Each structure stands twice: as C-alpha cells, then as structure tokens.
Design a protein around this motif. Structure first.
Motif, PDB file in Angstrom:
ATOM      1  N   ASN A   1       0.825  -1.204   0.000  1.00 55.72           N
ATOM      2  CA  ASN A   1       0.000   0.000   0.000  1.00 55.72           C
ATOM      3  C   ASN A   1       0.862   1.259   0.000  1.00 55.72           C
ATOM      4  O   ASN A   1       0.669   2.152  -0.833  1.00 55.72           O
ATOM      5  N   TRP A   2       1.823   1.347   0.920  1.00 53.20           N
ATOM      6  CA  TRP A   2       2.725   2.491   0.965  1.00 53.20           C
ATOM      7  C   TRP A   2       3.985   2.117   1.735  1.00 53.20           C
ATOM      8  O   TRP A   2       4.033   1.089   2.419  1.00 53.20           O
TER       9      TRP A   2
ATOM     10  N   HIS B   1       3.528   9.253  12.054  1.00 47.90           N
ATOM     11  CA  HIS B   1       3.299   9.173  10.619  1.00 47.90           C
ATOM     12  C   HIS B   1       1.821   8.957  10.320  1.00 47.90           C
ATOM     13  O   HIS B   1       1.021   8.652  11.208  1.00 47.90           O
ATOM     14  N   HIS B   2       1.465   9.125   9.049  1.00 46.97           N
ATOM     15  CA  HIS B   2       0.089   8.946   8.612  1.00 46.97           C
ATOM     16  C   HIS B   2      -0.197   7.474   8.324  1.00 46.97           C
ATOM     17  O   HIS B   2       0.711   6.653   8.173  1.00 46.97           O
TER      18      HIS B   2
ATOM     19  N   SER C   1      -3.037   6.515   5.948  1.00 46.10           N
ATOM     20  CA  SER C   1      -3.510   6.362   4.579  1.00 46.10           C
ATOM     21  C   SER C   1      -2.363   6.569   3.601  1.00 46.10           C
ATOM     22  O   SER C   1      -2.018   5.665   2.833  1.00 46.10           O
ATOM     23  N   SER C   2      -1.767   7.760   3.625  1.00 43.91           N
ATOM     24  CA  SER C   2      -0.589   8.047   2.819  1.00 43.91           C
ATOM     25  C   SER C   2       0.662   7.982   3.684  1.00 43.91           C
ATOM     26  O   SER C   2       0.592   7.602   4.857  1.00 43.91           O
ATOM     27  N   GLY C   3       1.807   8.349   3.118  1.00 47.61           N
ATOM     28  CA  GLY C   3       3.039   8.373   3.881  1.00 47.61           C
ATOM     29  C   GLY C   3       3.650   9.756   3.949  1.00 47.61           C
ATOM     30  O   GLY C   3       4.120  10.287   2.939  1.00 47.61           O
ATOM     31  N   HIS C   4       3.652  10.348   5.141  1.00 46.72           N
ATOM     32  CA  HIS C   4       4.164  11.696   5.350  1.00 46.72           C
ATOM     33  C   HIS C   4       4.674  11.821   6.777  1.00 46.72           C
ATOM     34  O   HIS C   4       4.036  11.330   7.712  1.00 46.72           O
TER      35      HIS C   4
END
Ligand SMILES: *[C@@H]1O[C@H](CO)[C@@H](O[C@@H]2O[C@H](CO)[C@@H](O[C@@H]3O[C@H](CO)[C@@H](O)[C@H](O)[C@@H]3O)[C@H](O)[C@H]2NC(C)=O)[C@H](O)[C@H]1NC(C)=O
Ligand SMILES: *[C@@H]1O[C@H](CO)[C@@H](O[C@@H]2O[C@H](CO)[C@@H](O[C@@H]3O[C@H](CO)[C@@H](O)[C@H](O)[C@@H]3O)[C@H](O)[C@H]2NC(C)=O)[C@H](O)[C@H]1NC(C)=O
Lengths: 949, 243
Positions: free
Chosen positions: A97-98, A133-134, A136-139
C-alpha cells in the motif's frame, strides 16, 4: 513432453517459519489469516482449507526482522529491520500500500493515536527520537526530541482518543518520568516525576487500565502501585489483603492489559501472572478491587472482543489428571489432554456450550501461545476458534463443535533442514519367499530336485489362482510399503535443528512418522548415517544419528529405525569430552552390519559395535586407516593414524597463518562412486589415462582483509594419506561467496570479481600421461608423480546459491551439474560444455573428433529449466540420489519449501518410448499372417493349374 | 551384466520383429511363386533344343554303341556333302535380384519407428568403431558396443532364418506326364538366344573332336568271376507271396 507430463511424478510442499506475530481479526473473516514469522517471511493462511494465498520473502541473513505489527480493518502495518524502513500491506489482495523511511534510531515501541473520531496517526518512539506518521498516505511532519533521553528508557506508549499522547520513562534504578504531548502540533504540556526504587523493568510488565491508570505489581513487599497520570498528584500504594497474596520468590510479575484501538476508552480488567502458573481476573473500579474466578492451574489465557462484549479463553490441563512438577498428564487412555473454556470479562459467568477438548500424540510438547477469534452468530449462540501453538514448531486449529476437534495441522518444523538421507524398503512378499526358497546350505542332487519341484508346484498354484481371479473379473500404505522393479519410491529421513525427526515418502509426500528429541538447543551439529540396509532379513535396519552442542559441549548418539521409527535396544554410553569426529568403515562383520568408530578429544578411537570379530579385523588392518582434522580458528591441518590396537600417532602436520588466510569449506570424494572408463581417447587413436584419487582433500582459503583490489582466493589440493600438496592455485581479484564441487577427477569452483562486476567460472581437471602405472592396487605411499592440472574460465550471469552433480550407481550416463538460482529455478548443464580441453583456434583433429570452439559466453536457456512452475523461495541445498534403472536421479531441493523430481541425464534409454502406437504394429502383424494364408492357396491353385494345363 | 531393462519392452519389440521378418520372408517367397509366368515357345526352338540334347547324349554315352552305327550317326550329323547343321539356317531400372531393396526398406521403417531403444546385447566383444553402426539413436559414449539396437537385431535376424526357410520348404517332383513338358520348357529356355550358326559350327567341330572307344569289347572280365549275389538275392525274393 514436459507440458504433457505436468504432475505425474513430482510434488512440492510449501512451508512457513515459526509463528511470531499472528492476528485473528477481520470480523468478516472469509478465509483471511495473516502470519508474519521470524524468518523474514509474511504469509496468509486460509481458515477453511489452509493453503497459502500470498507470501513475501525479503531477507534472512541478519536484517529485515519484523519487530511489531498492527492491523486495521482492511490493511496491515509492519516494521522490518530495526527502525529504518516500514511498509504497509493489504489482505484482500497482496502487494504494497505504501512505504516510509524512518530515521537512525533504536526501535522500541509503536501505537495508534486517534484525534477525535478515529486513528489517523501512528506514533513510533525510538531510543531518543520520537515521530508520528500517517496511515492512509506516507508523510512525516510530527517529529521532535524529549527533554531527557540519555539516562532514560522509553517504553509502553499509551494513547487516548481525547487527543493526548503519553510517554512513559523508567530507568533501571532511580526515578520515573511521564511526559505528555498534543496531537495537533508537538507541544510539551507537563511532566510528572515519580520516585520508585522497586521499578526495574517496564518493557514487558506494567500496563494501562481503566482511564489512564498505571498499575505495577511487586513481589518484594508484595504490593501494588496504582497511579493516575490524567489527574491526581502522586502514586497510591495498595496492599493485597482481600486477595490470596501468593507471589513467586524468583519471578517478576506480569500484567495483561487490553485496550481496543478503535474504541477511544479502555477496559478495567486485566490478568496478573503469579508463579509459573497462577492466573486470576481482578477488577479495579476506583479504589476497591474485586477478585473472582480464582484460577488454580490455568496454563494459558487469551483475550478477545467482537463487539461491546469481551471474552477470555482459559486453557486448562483437564480431561483423571495428575500434575507433575511442571508438565501435566492425564491417566485415562491417551494422556496429555487439554480443555479450552470461555469466560466473561465483565462478570464471572462460564458458558455451558463452550467446551473444547483435545489431546496430542507426542510427549514433551506443551502449549506456548494461543489466539482466539470469537464472532457473534444467530441470536443466542457464541462461536470461536482457538489456535494452540505447539512447543517446538507446529500449528493447530480447533472448531467449536464437529466430528473432529482438529481441523488442519501444518508442520512448521520442516523449514530448516540440517541433514537428510534416503533408505530403501525392506522386501516384497513373493520376492522374499523366492529368496528363502533358494537358500541352500548343504544338500544333495535329490534335495535340490525336490525343492525345484515344490517351487514349480507353488508357481502352478499361484498361476491357477491368478487365472481364477481374471476369470472372476471378466464375468494403510505403511503396512504394505512394498518395492517394485525400479526402486523410485524411497523413505527419506529429515532432521531439524529444532530437534524433530521427520519421515516422508518420495512418492506421495505424506508424513509417515515424526519423533521428538528430549532437548535440543540451537547451533547444534547433526549427522545421520545408515549402517544396516534393508535387503537382509535377519535383523531390523539400523540407523545411527550423532548430535553435539556447541555452547555446552555434550555429544549423544541415537540408534533408530528409518522404516518404522521405533529405536532399537542397543545404545553405547558416551564419556570424557564430546565426540570429535567419526567415519564409516566399509568392512562388515557381526551379521551383515558395518562398523562405526569415533574420535574423542583425548585422541582415542571408540567402536560402536563392540564385537570380538570387529576388534580382530580392526587389529588385522591396524596401519590402514588415517585421520585428518581441520581447524579454522587454529588454522592447523594435522593428521593421525591408528597403530596396533587403539592409539593415536601424528603422521603429517600442516599449519596455515590465520591472519593471512582463513579456511572456509572442505570437500572430498563420495564413498559411493564407481568409475566406468579410466581413460579418454585423443587426437589420432592414442589413449590418455586419468588420475583418480580416492584419498584426496581440497581446502578453500580466503583472504581476511577485504579490499577493492587486494583480494586473495586460492585452493589447496592435499592428500589426506601423506602430507603432500599436488596443486595450489591462487587468484588475484576474487572475493565473496565461493562454491566448490568435487567429482571423479574435476573440481568446479565459482567466485566473483571486484575489478569487473562479473562471476567467473573456473574448472580444474587432473590428467595423467600416456603410460599407466601398476593399475592393480592404488596407494598414496607409492606413485611419486605429479598430475597435470588444466584450468579454464567462463562467465555465468547468476549467483549460484546451490550446486550439485548428478551421481549414478555405475556411472555410464552423462554428468550433469545442477545449479540453483535466486529466482528458484534449477538449471542442469552438461559437463561437456565446461571442459578444459577447449582449443582456442579451431584445429582439424579437435573439430573432427568431438569439440566446439571455445567461447566465454554461457546463456541460461529457458528450455533447460527443471522448475517450470514450482519454484523454491530460498535454495539452501539440493540432494541427488541414484535410482536403480540406469539413467534416473531423484533430485530433492530443500530450504523454505520442499520439492522433488526426477532428472534425465541423456533423455531416456531404459524405458519404452511413450509414443508407441500398438494399433499399427498389431495391424501389420495380423495382416502378414492374413496375406500368407491368402497367398498359400493362390500358389497351390497356380501350381495345380500349370500342372493340368 | 547391467542396464536393468523392463519386461514389457521385450514383449513389444522382439516377438513383433521376429514375426514381422518371418512372415515378410514367407510373403516374398509366395509372391515370387505367384508372379512366375510361363514363356512362349516356338516349335522350331524346341526342335533344335532336342537336337542339341541328342548330340549331347551321343557325346556322353557313345561307348556302348556299335562302331558302324556310331560313324553313321556322326556322318549324318556332319555329312560334308550336305549336312543338316550346315544348310538348315534360321534368321536373326537395373533389376538385379531385387531382394535387398525390400529388406532395406523394412529395416529403415523399423529404425524410424523406434528412435531410442535398447533391444539386446551381443556376447561377442565388439570394437568402438562399430558403435555408429549399432546404436544409431542413443547418445552414449561411455557405453559398450555390445548393446545393439533394433536395426542390427533385424539385420542379424534376416540371416538367422536363411537356412531355416529351406527346412520348412523343399523341392517337388511329380506329374510324370507334365515332367516331359517341364523338360522341354526348361531346355528351350536354355536355347532362347539367337546364335544358331555359331552353336551349330561349335557342335559340328566338337563332334569331330570326339573319338570312339567301344566299351563292349571288355567282356572277358565278367566271364572269369563268381556269381553268388544271384542266390542271396534269390533267397530274399521267395518269402513274398502273391496278393
Ligand atoms: C602392483 O601392486 C600389487 C599389489 O600391491 C603387487 O602385487 C603384490 O606384490 C607383493 C610383492 O611382490 C606380493 O607380496 C608377496 O607375498 C608373498 C607371501 O604372501 C611373498 O612370499 C612374496 O615374496 C611377496 O612379498 C603380493 O602377494 C602381490 N599381490 C597380488 C594380489 O599379486 C604387484 O607386485 C605390483 N606390481 C608392480 C609392477 O608394482
Ligand atoms: C502454472 O500454474 C498455473 C496455475 O497456478 C497454470 O494455470 C492453470 O493451468 C491448468 C493446467 O496446468 C489449467 O487447468 C486446465 O483447466 C481446463 C478447464 O478450465 C481443463 O480443460 C484443462 O485440462 C486443464 O486442467 C488452468 O485452467 C490454468 N489456470 C489459469 C488461470 O490459466 C499455468 O498454466 C501454469 N503454467 C504453465 C503450465 O506453463
């Protein structure tokens, strides 16, 4: 031909490492079951059938280990290595997924934090650095330092749904600090400083209960800390007077807290570990504690939740039970039976419908871990599934209520294989009957004639019975385990580093028998040998197994049966220091059995089959057996020999400087190898003799220092009989993993070049001159000659993880080399291509006889791929066993999975061709007879007509 | 002894090939008998053929002949005035025993059907230069030349039963009336070629080259002798009665 014969006589079994972090979530739960192991492999099992849906392999040397694993409703998050790279997977489908790159810290803890509604951030705390960290996404936006990190250990981060992140810090012996941050932006609110001289560890121990309540047990004064980090000022001490205060002397108590991630709040119920086995459910409201269900034995517990209700599974050792010091035994019929029951978490009710019972077969294994998957169904029925984990390596699944409690069992102890061997079947009934009927010691002509008549009568009776059977027709594999014309089905023995002996059949692949050793620690050396074969009737087959430890240094020897499994009543004692080395004596005595002798540290020989004739033969041979021992750290290659009865004497000694060179691997000559042709043809008609040495060892040495240019790779060819180096070859730009394979007279070793990024392939061959020696009896004392050594170089674009050569009984077929690839496909290539007699320029006689111009380019053809579909993730090794016909070798590749096939050296010259139409042959055979019968009368009438007319 | 072979290849190769070659030979023999056709014969050719036979028996059996009649016959054949031989004058692919092509074709088809096979080994030690002969379809260099393929098996089989075929068959001699016709047919088949003049001249000179030696003059040998066979012979004629 391969596409026609897809799966006729081949099979692969896929295996998984020991379960470390497995989850039993997915409320829908069609078949999904995630398992991440301690061998850097992540797999997905099926609840109904049990097969693998998707599996991923990354690493396994020293890195990529899974530390923690979180599970959302549809996605899985996990951390590999030690806090550098993180990647998230999916379960409906399978892939990534990420991905996220972390900082340079020490991974300690992770958790989920939810702002107001649900989780959106994951908190990762390292030794000093802290980040969020997030999901759903990666940030990465939330990252900062804590006030004191040097003399502070941070563990058990607790998070609330209100929007505050809490961090706990407990030093070995001093103070404790609780620190708190906001979720919007990193801002330190306040810090709580609490003095606890009795708080040593916090990694696995204290938990969070109720609404931010810290509870810590102590057996020193036998009392509880409860403290409020949300409110109040200080800690409060609870003495234990309402409960049965029984704390083990040398045992640090453990807490079992549960807090569902989706729900912002938490529960106020938890288990306390007391002594080896003493669990109890306690509830804490505000200041008062309620205890109920004082569990007496309660070997294992588990928590579970499906909705607003919480369930606790208790696994007890019941069935007439009789409890020993630490193990549990039931004295009724089967022994070692356990029950699983369900209990309420709020109250202390017990479900009357829930009652699981199951018993094991082997003795010694005890449950270690267990999960629970409870789901609501109907209106007034609760169903759940329990996954009990066996002590060494084995998975088991149980159903609520059905005909059989055991649904699917998967053996996870067959991944790491140390030593392997194959043995044949005893005999066949009719064949054994014929063998017994022929056996004659001393008889006359009349006796043999009578025996022949009796055998003929028996054959006639059998023929009559067979004819009756066909006239009628016209109108357990363990028990039989019979042989056939071509022995292709063989009983193979697998030995695990864990300490489990496995027996599988070459044809089907079903587990026949499985035995467990008393106690085996890691880094243990195993060795399996076969002394007595199966061809002889008079005593059961004997299989010997040596095992030795590395840390402690004990050596033990077992004598078991490879056919049935039960061990014999013969076992020798072992004393002094651990057994050093052993060899198998070809000479046989006693009944039909071979002799095995072992070396101890005191430099003495110990014989296993103590027999007067054994000792007589050994004393007769006396100066006939030599012994070479090789040391890596010592770097000393010294030799010994037997003198007279039993004594060790130094004969030849060799020392290598450890600082310059280091020993890596040592290969020799196989004992079961026969050479058909002892020479080769040359240009015109002149013959060329080879140099075959049954006693010769090749040692491989590598440079200690590693540099871009300065690399030392070499091989030494020494005789184990007399200290004498035949040929010593040295490279200049070779480094990395080195693989060496020894054969009849040619050595194949591979390396990697640092100068030009490539893998060079060097083939070494020994050749004699045109004239032969005695050639009646070979010995290394005589033969004062130096054989010619030929070297050639090629290019192979692969890694060559594994390497082996096909070995036959007589040795009349071709010699194929089997090489494994990182992909998993195994490729077989002929030795003729990699021949040292490859002239550079094409000359007349060489091209005329049989040769191809030399060219350093080897391409991997897809047609020469034994592995068409079935692949092996990790190729640890391959074993080749010679069959019985002529040109058939059974190849089994072990490692992460097991796969077996038959390799064809040169097509087939022993069995009928598959494409053989019998209709045409029969039609022609009948037509010839019909035509001769037709033409007979034509000839007769022609003769008659010519005579008359 | 090595190279353990199956028991189900010997029952589908050896017996079939043996029966095939046996019945192929039988078919060839019977078809050769069927295809045999008689040859047209003119009365004239039979005439000179019988004349030649007469001259031949005169040459062979001429000792037991009166001298006067012998010179009468010799003059009649010669007769320098007229002569019968002198005046009577008349006017004037590469199939070579095709049996190799069928056997070659059969062996080629048998070898084409069986690509990689091991039929039987020969006990006789054979050299390695005959290995391309014998295997022809097996990729083996370390193997001995004893193990031959089906091609050599059939090649030796066709010669194995060469003398066996005559054991079942044989010669025939009957039809006394047709025996004479057979003799005329064969004799005139000998006398087919049209070289009558040179044959007549050669016989004319050969007949003159013959001498005469009356074997009847040696009668004195019998007169001084013993007659004892005629009563051991006469004793064994008495026991038989009259039917
Ligand atoms: C090739 O090697 C073989 C085996 O080593 C040699 O044959 C052996 O030769 C020895 C010495 O000649 C024989 O020993 C004899 O023992 C008897 C008593 O048993 C003794 O009276 C003789 O004087 C001699 O010492 C041994 O029997 C013999 N073995 C066999 C199986 O024949 C052979 O000589 C070697 N050939 C060459 C050319 O080196
Ligand atoms: C490698 O393995 C895959 C399976 O994971 C192969 O795909 C499957 O191959 C089998 C035959 O090996 C196919 O079965 C066939 O089914 C039809 C009816 O649908 C039947 O009539 C045939 O006799 C045969 O049993 C199967 O359909 C096929 N599945 C898919 C999705 O293609 C694949 O072919 C293998 N690779 C090879 C052989 O190179």
């Amino acid at each position: 031909v391969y596409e026609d014969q897809v799966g006729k006589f081949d099979w692969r079994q896929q295996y998984v490492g020991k379960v470390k972090f497995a989850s039993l979530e997915f409320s829908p739960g069609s078949k999904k079951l995630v398992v991440a192991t301690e061998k850097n492999v992540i797999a997905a099992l099926n609840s109904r059938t049990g097969e693998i849906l998707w599996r991923h392999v990354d690493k396994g040397t020293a890195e990529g280990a899974v530390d923690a694993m979180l599970l959302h409703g549809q996605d899985v998050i996990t951390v590999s290595n030690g806090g550098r790279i993180m990647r998230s997977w999916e379960t409906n489908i399978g892939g990534l997924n990420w991905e996220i790159t972390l900082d340079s810290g020490s991974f300690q803890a992770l958790g989920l934090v939810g702002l107001q509604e649900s989780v959106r951030y994951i908190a990762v705390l390292k030794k000093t650095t802290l980040a969020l960290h997030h999901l759903s996404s990666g940030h990465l936006k939330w990252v900062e330092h804590l006030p004191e990190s040097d003399s502070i250990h941070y563990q058990m981060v607790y998070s609330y749904g209100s929007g505050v992140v809490w961090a706990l810090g407990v030093v070995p012996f001093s103070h404790v600090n609780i620190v708190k941050f906001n979720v919007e932006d990193g801002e330190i609110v306040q810090q709580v400083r609490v003095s606890t001289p009795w708080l040593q560890h916090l990694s696995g121990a204290c938990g969070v209960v109720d609404e931010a309540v810290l509870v810590c047990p102590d057996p020193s004064s036998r009392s509880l800390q409860t403290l409020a980090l949300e409110t109040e000022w200080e800690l409060r001490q609870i003495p234990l007077q309402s409960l049965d205060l029984e704390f083990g002397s040398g045992f640090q108590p453990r807490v079992l807290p549960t807090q569902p991630n989706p729900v912002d709040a938490s529960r106020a119920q938890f288990f306390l570990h007391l002594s080896p086995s003493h669990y109890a459910l306690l509830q804490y409201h505000y200041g008062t504690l309620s205890l109920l269900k004082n569990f007496p034995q309660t070997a294992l517990v588990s928590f579970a939740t499906t909705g607003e209700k919480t369930v606790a599974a208790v696994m007890a050792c019941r069935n007439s039970f009789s409890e020993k010091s630490s193990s549990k035994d039931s004295l009724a019929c089967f022994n070692q039976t356990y029950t699983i029951n369900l209990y309420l978490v709020e109250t202390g009710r017990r479900l009357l419908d829930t009652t699981i019972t199951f018993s094991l077969e082997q003795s010694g294994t005890r449950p270690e871990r267990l999960y629970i998957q409870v789901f609501l169904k109907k209106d007034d029925s609760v169903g759940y599934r329990a996954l009990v984990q066996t002590e060494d390596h084995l998975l088991l699944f149980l159903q609520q209520l059905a005909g059989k409690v055991v649904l699917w069992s998967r053996e996870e102890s067959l991944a790491e294989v140390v030593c392997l061997e194959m043995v044949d079947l005893p005999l066949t009934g009719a064949q054994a009957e014929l063998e017994g009927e022929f056996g004659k010691k001393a008889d006359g002509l009349l006796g043999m004639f009578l025996k022949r008549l009796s055998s003929q009568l028996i054959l006639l009776q059998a023929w009559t019975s067979h004819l009756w059977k066909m006239f009628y027709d016209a109108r357990i594999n363990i028990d039989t385990l019979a042989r056939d014309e071509f022995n292709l089905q063989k009983m193979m023995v697998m030995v695990t580093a864990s300490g489990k002996l496995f027996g599988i059949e070459s044809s089907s692949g079903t587990i026949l028998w499985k035995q467990y050793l008393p106690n085996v620690k890691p880094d243990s050396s195993f060795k399996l040998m076969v002394q007595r074969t199966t061809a002889h009737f008079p005593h059961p087959p004997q299989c010997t197994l040596l095992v030795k430890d590395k840390e402690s240094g004990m050596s033990s020897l077992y004598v078991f049966n490879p056919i049935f499994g039960k061990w014999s009543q013969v076992a020798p004692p072992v004393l002094k220091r651990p057994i050093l080395q052993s060899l198998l004596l070809p000479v046989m005595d006693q009944d039909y059995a071979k002799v095995l002798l072992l070396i101890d540290d005191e430099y003495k020989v110990t014989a296993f089959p103590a027999t007067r004739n054994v000792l007589r033969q050994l004393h007769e041979l006396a100066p006939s057996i030599f012994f070479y021992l090789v040391d890596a750290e010592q770097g000393r290659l010294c030799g010994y020999r037997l003198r007279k009865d039993l004594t060790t004497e130094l004969s030849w000694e060799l020392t290598i400087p450890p600082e310059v060179q280091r020993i890596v691997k040592v290969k020799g000559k196989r004992s079961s190898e026969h050479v058909h042709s002892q020479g080769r043809v040359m240009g015109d008609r002149s013959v060329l003799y080879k140099s075959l040495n049954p006693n010769l060892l090749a040692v491989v040495t590598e440079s200690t220092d590693a540099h871009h240019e300065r690399t030392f790779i070499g091989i030494f060819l020494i005789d184990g009989v007399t200290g004498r180096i035949i040929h010593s070859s040295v490279q200049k730009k070779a480094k990395g993993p080195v693989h060496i394979v020894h054969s009849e007279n040619w050595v194949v070793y591979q390396y990697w070049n640092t100068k030009a990024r490539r893998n060079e392939f060097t083939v070494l061959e020994l050749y004699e001159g045109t004239e032969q020696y005695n050639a009646t009896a070979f010995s290394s004392l005589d033969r004062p000659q130096l054989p010619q050594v030929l070297q050639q170089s090629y290019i192979f674009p692969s890694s060559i993880s594994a390497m082996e050569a096909t070995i036959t009984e007589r040795g009349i077929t071709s010699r194929h080399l089997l090489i494994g690839l990182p992909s998993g496909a195994i490729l077989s290539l002929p030795k003729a291509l990699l021949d040292p007699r490859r002239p550079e320029i094409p000359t007349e006689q060489s091209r005329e006889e049989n040769l191809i111009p030399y060219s350093p380019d080897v391409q991997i053809h897809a047609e020469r791929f034994i592995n068409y579909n079935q692949t092996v993730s990790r190729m640890r090794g391959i074993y080749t066993a010679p069959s019985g016909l002529e040109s058939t070798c059974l190849v089994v590749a072990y490692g992460l999975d097991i796969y077996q096939t038959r390799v064809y050296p040169s097509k087939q010259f022993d069995v009928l061709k598959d494409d053989y139409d019998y209709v045409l042959i029969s039609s022609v055979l009948f037509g010839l007879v019909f035509a001769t019968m037709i033409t007979k009368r034509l000839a007769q009438v022609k003769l008659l007509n010519r005579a008359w007319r | 002894p090595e190279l353990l072979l199956d028991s189900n290849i010997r029952l589908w190769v050896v017996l079939p090939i043996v029966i095939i070659t046996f019945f192929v030979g039988m078919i060839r023999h019977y078809v050769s008998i069927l295809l045999q056709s008689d040859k047209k014969l003119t009365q004239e050719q039979v005439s000179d053929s019988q004349v030649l036979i007469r001259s031949r028996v005169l040459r062979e059996n001429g000792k037991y002949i009166p001298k006067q009649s012998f010179l009468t016959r010799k003059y009649y054949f010669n007769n320098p005035e007229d002569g019968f031989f002198k005046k009577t004058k008349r006017k004037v692919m590469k199939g070579n025993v095709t049996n190799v092509l069928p056997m070659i074709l059969i062996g080629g088809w048998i070898n084409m059907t069986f690509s990689g096979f091991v039929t039987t080994k020969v006990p006789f030690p054979l050299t390695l230069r005959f290995k391309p002969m014998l295997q022809q379809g097996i990729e083996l260099l370390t193997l001995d030349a004893s193990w031959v393929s089906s091609a050599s098996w059939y090649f030796l089989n066709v010669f194995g039963l060469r003398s066996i075929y005559s054991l079942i068959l044989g010669q025939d001699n009957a039809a006394d009336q047709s025996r004479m016709m057979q003799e005329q047919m064969t004799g005139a088949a000998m006398a087919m070629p049209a070289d009558t003049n040179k044959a007549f001249k050669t016989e004319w000179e050969a007949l003159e080259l013959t001498d005469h030696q009356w074997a009847l003059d040696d009668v004195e040998e019998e007169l001084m002798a013993k007659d004892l066979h005629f009563e051991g012979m006469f004793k064994k004629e008495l026991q038989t009665s009259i039917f």
